[PDB]
Amino acid sequence: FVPWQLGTITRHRDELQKLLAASLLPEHPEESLGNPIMTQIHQSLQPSSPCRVCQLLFSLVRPMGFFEDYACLCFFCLYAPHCWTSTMAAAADLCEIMHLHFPEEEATYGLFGPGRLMGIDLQLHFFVQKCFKTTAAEKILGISNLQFLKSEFIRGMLTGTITFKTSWTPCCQITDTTTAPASGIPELARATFCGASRPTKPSLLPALIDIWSTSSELLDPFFSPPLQADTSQGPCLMHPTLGLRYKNGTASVCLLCECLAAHPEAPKALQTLQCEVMGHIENNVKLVDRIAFVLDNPFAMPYVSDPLLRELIRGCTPQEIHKHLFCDPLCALNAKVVSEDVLFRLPREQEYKKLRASAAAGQLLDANTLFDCEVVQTLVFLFKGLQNARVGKTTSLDIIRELTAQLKRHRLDLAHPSQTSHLYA
């Protein structure tokens, strides 16, 4: 069983349809007193609510093919960026794990939608809170403080306003002066996915473009949206920012972060683009002009094989590319955690079988070895929260002050977060 397979998405087009419909915003929220979808998402974001996915799983465990297939999904999620595509894929792969190991269970059918799992529940379990990580007991209270803050500011993005200064061991491996520097993905994963030997799994770009052009205007039939649904903002309740807002030629749903999780050569295609932008021009041309100059060229970016991804990146505005490579802290967090090999290279069966054994034995899920820091993660969500919701000016500049300090402690070079918050969505 392997995650991130476009085929798994098409197989469950029926169930996902229930998930995609349930992840759209109401067309006219002001004309109803409530809405059951928003009520449940809002409930998932209250700090003392149960985790609906953790509760589903415990329901099923009170085989062997199951702890080893589930631990694969967890490992893939741990090495995946935070975005819509990762939630879609984790949704599909959770269907498959449930249809594989539990075909007789009623929880397996009608898995998504109102009263069952929702997009936000996937986000919380696999990406925001990472319930699957193996963590020591003495780290539990500390983690809950940070999870509390994340829930509050994510809920703020849903409802529109916020209700830190009171609330705020080295935090991670980077700030750890003892540790040996990060090699890369752990050894067993490098053995299993790496090497010129490997063909690619199918790209998720077609599904992404279908769903989002059908149910939003992000890009100006797998998914059919209802009316009394907001077809201008897409299935954004599966995205970290919970909405689609436009500013300065950018949008709150970053398309290049979607590419990091939906296409096999996006991680490095962008890393080389960043290198071309910094290195080719040797004078004081500003970053959005450098991007226009690099991508003005008719052959632009030959290092990218798939002409579709090339067509997409060259179609982005210089502001979208500026925001993603140099400004937004969540884009920076997304780029540092992804492993394009784990996500998209077809695994070698001999090495994969030990990986499943090791992960289900609880050995590869303690931390993302490329980047893993709940402190920086939390501030990234706090920042996106002040960017997308009403927040007090004084806490707002408190977050900005601390995020900048941590960005430097962790060797992440961005424009100043206050500039980023002025410029972009």
Add this chain to the structure above:
Amino acid sequence: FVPWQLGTITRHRDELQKLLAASLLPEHPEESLGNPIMTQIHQSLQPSSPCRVCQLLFSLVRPMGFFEDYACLCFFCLYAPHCWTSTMAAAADLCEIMHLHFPEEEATYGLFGPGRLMGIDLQLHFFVQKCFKTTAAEKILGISNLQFLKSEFIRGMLTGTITFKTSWPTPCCQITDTTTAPASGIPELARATFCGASRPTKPSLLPALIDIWSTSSELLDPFFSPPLQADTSQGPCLMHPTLGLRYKNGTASVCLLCECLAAHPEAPKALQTLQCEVMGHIENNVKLVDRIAFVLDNPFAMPYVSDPLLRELIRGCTPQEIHKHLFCDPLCALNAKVVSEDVLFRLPREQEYKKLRASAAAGQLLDANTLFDCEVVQTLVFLFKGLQNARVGKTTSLDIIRELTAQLKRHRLDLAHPSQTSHLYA
């Protein structure tokens, strides 16, 4: 091809008139819902919009001496003050460079105006942001923070209010790197090319200044005819750093002595000699504005100035304009520190000039102005002019003033205290 030539201005009177017309303010701005000129300038000042001049250039390369003629223009700007005249000259010399090396492409004609280039675009590219300086890649992010601040406060001067403490942050420049020697002058290649009494000077740009600004403004109390429905009391001020002409205490937001620094070959040394006369001749406690009046009442004043036009202009300025320029305004101080009258106005020796161009086209001479170059001090100067010409909160206004005073002392610039200056002058 040599920049800063009155002749270059004269031949392109056609394109340059179109720039001056597009550089006046609306006559009655409140009676229209918008204005395409103001909308575009305001668009050029947003931090994530492209540089129109950079975009013109890349569109033109996507010859063998274009890169060297453009690099000469850049070198001159680097050693030119920030003012109307320097924007006019860069406009003219950009025309000339386009007719020499790109005469069949349509971009060259209709170079200026709505939908094309504007004064703000020339100012941003050649003077405020200096896109041509050779900068290391690892320093770009930091630079964009400072350019952000500059754009915002210049945009405030355009619209009237501002929309620092959040964004503000090794020596910053050669002045505060106290392990280096104190600056002596322009590079050797430039010294060889421009210096020596043997060298004849190019024509004074003062007539062009005096003509254009008297026909389309009141700054002085036909190259250019202004349209109707335009504010003919403020001149082509959208080519000037303050984006308007306002008056206070016998001064105006357009400083005439800064125009002279860029428009006339002996203004830099004349004013520095005047500064010595003002400081040194009186030996008792007479105020600076009276000392200025005493030096310039004498009928034989400033005999070190040969050109009687420059001499009469300086002597006609009010003691506040001269007080403001020599002792108070921080943008006037930066302008005096950056300018080289030799580069701008002495006829180059062609054998050494060929070496200059090769160096400048190879990027070696555009790393930094060796007389003064500090983007920190540049940014604070634009912040201060912004609080002076636009609505800014009291707490952030007094924050700029205190940081600017600290940097002024750290860079050995002796000015009156900026709070005094902000109270006194435009």
